[PDB]
Subunit: 257 residues, 4 copies
């Protein structure tokens, strides 16, 4: 009922694989029509194949999220071919891990441009049709780094701190037009790329368990409920809110000896 996404169209940026692709799966299972983009045709093609393998009829487009003219054209095409976008998930992103004193300004700027400026560009592009149709959701994928810092991730933390405030600002500016803009802030989600950090007692695995009241890594399934919730009519009075999905990390001082 209120948690259903039946009839709704969702654009999840960068959802050819990874967390975005998993959110798309959940959205599809909730009844949503799936639209996504990536920066090259090869990724879009492989993504579409992967969606087909799961029985999901997705719609994939090649576009750089930092390219405003391109994104505007993409949204127009989506409107022609699928329909007006009800839900935007700004998921596309990069991370760099570089000691700040060693990080080239060009690289800092790139992280900011993809992770902060691009969500503005894509939000701006989808908003007119959301406003016109009378309801819209914009969900920004934030981070623990929207709240806490760490050596080597200065650009990423700056971007994610910014993305948190862009969320609150979009909520503020467009709330009156029945737009709800919120964040999802994943904790440590176990993915194949970090499998060596969990090989059997691993120091890093221990660090994560000790930081986490839930005493485990998160999963992509852990993000499905929170993501569908924020995309659904069940959260229509949740606005400008960052929903952290972290097993309690941000609530806990940590497991001490």
């Amino acid at each position: 009922n209120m948690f259903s996404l039946q009839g709704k169209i969702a654009l999840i940026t960068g959802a050819s694989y990874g967390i975005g692709f998993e959110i798309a799966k959940a959205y599809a299972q909730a009844g949503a029509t799936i639209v996504f983009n990536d920066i090259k045709q090869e990724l879009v093609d492989k993504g579409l194949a992967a969606y087909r393998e799961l029985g999901i009829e997705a719609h994939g487009y090649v576009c750089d999220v930092t390219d405003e003219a391109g994104i505007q054209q993409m949204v127009s095409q989506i409107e022609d071919e699928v329909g007006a976008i009800d839900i935007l998930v700004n998921n596309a992103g990069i991370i760099r891990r570089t000691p700040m004193l060693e990080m080239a300004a060009e690289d800092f700027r790139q992280v900011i441009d993809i992770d902060l400026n691009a969500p503005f560009i894509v939000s701006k592009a989808v908003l007119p049709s959301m406003i016109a149709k009378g309801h819209g959701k914009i969900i920004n994928i934030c981070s623990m780094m929207s709240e806490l810092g760490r050596e080597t991730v200065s650009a990423y933390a700056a971007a994610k701190g910014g993305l948190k405030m862009l969320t609150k600002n979009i909520a503020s500016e467009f709330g009156e037009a029945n737009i709800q803009c919120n964040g999802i802030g994943p904790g440590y989600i176990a993915t194949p790329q970090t499998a060596p950090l969990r090989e059997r007692r691993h120091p890093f695995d221990q660090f994560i368990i000790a930081k986490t009241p839930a005493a485990r890594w998160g999963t992509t399934e852990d993000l499905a409920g929170p993501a569908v919730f924020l995309a659904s009519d069940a959260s229509n009075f949740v606005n400008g809110h960052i929903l952290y999905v972290d097993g309690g990390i941000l609530a806990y001082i940590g497991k001490q000896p």
Copy 2:
């Protein structure tokens, strides 16, 4: 599916009427078995009648939430008659509006005892069985006053600020036993008791609209999705988190002239 409360038993304290009764309705619609208490039989009886009128078979008990011995006995009885409690919503509360310099220490203490100490008492009472059965949810009804102050509500703000940290602490301490403890923080919810403040352009109504990006008062239905979400298996990696349901108030500096 993941948002279903089928088979789950929920204790909502003070749910003979008001916001708690509305949360119970939503929980019942989601499949939950409803249990509640209030401080006198007259309220419990009327509450049960109201639940019956809606086709809800609730279970009502007379207990003061500040009475630990009583609450322990109540929980034991609920276990006998209904089953082990899967979900606790600490909803029972009072508000006093008194200028701080005019507030008797006894009255400040009463607000704290009902709104802060009692949620500890009831949480403590339900936790052993949640831990033993392998999953539990504790949802504390917080407030805008968990974050922001106002003249005349010093005791209430102190209590709700405390309740926010009790939430984070329970999450921290019991997370490893698969307990998720979270908060719901309603904004301004329109109820019959504040109907005169919305009579037609009303100054107070204008103050609320100007503070709120959504440009409206909240409803009890606005709380149903957030409450079911936090009670459900869909939020199993959300822990120690206060979910504000306020149309964006806490995100917004306000509508200026």
Copy 3:
């Protein structure tokens, strides 16, 4: 100049020893007249002797901070003997470390009463004269536990979370009368009572260093500047603010392997 406390009278509750006594030293060095209380004459007497040994002419009174009638009488006596109180530091407190399921409600309530209700009582008692004289400062000693939870400190975290909101509320309610109410939130301060936790590489010492960007325990001298700052005319537009003095703990995700 603006950081001077010359001519100002400061009441620091519980300052017969410990962090409060160290704050009093700093205040004395900044020019303040020192007033304090404790619950028994023996502590007040020893405190006064310790102040005299440092060349500080303090004024000590026997009063339980939870005893409103007593505190009202104490404040009246201070006004007679020293002058109207310009600065209140709510420092008196207890900590209990008890697993929540093992904590008697009486003990939870005691922590709340001393650490949360009493700062209200003492604030209420000093405010009329601050308002009448045209300026006042109230500084509440908060904690990392005003933000983060941990196993065994549920009552303390609830109290300190509450104290943070009492701070914001007093700021809100009395700001217009030129009262500034703010918090100081110490991190891990090294004191003789925790000397065994730093004996030489100690696991706990390592846990603290790893949590702290500054890579050290805090000192009481670390709190002197922040405390004098908030007591001084240099912070007259800082209000409702918790100033954390923690070497960066609350800003940092932690040192990972």
Copy 4:
């Protein structure tokens, strides 16, 4: 004593006029040697003249804060001519007020580049010498918009939200080298540019008073104490902290009718 800046060199970016120039005045009065930059010689020249008129011997350089190569050269020159920089205040900034749907991506990007990327560039440039000499302060001028959103200031809020996390990250990454990186977050500071908004009862003036417990606009003098505090040895264990100087705005739900 601990609040003194005697012997210390402070770079305040953009301090040819405005809030930065006022912070520089306070720093000079506290004993600091003043260094500043601006983007054109005309501003640097006029700034230096204004400093001379007050008896302050400042050192002015022409540099764009977004120009990394230029900033690196400027810092090297400052080291030659004045000495190693002890304190950096990232003050240079712009604000644009544009409805988000009407804001060109180039303009959004410019706000981000000056207000977020540039503080990274300048921080990076001063850090090696701070680390080598054994102590440094970096103070980032944040905003109410580091926490709250408003229509028309999406780029500015995104930048200031980012700047808050850059602060916490620098604190995290460089804390161990005795760098303290903190924020100052001014509220509504009355400046000549907003004089029409205070002409006599003005609607906007009323909006500000109603939002502010202190019941007044802030002044630049209100920022002097907080700024000197964070630049001084009195705040050596304050790190990763945003010090809001707002008369209580962020603590208060607002004055209701």
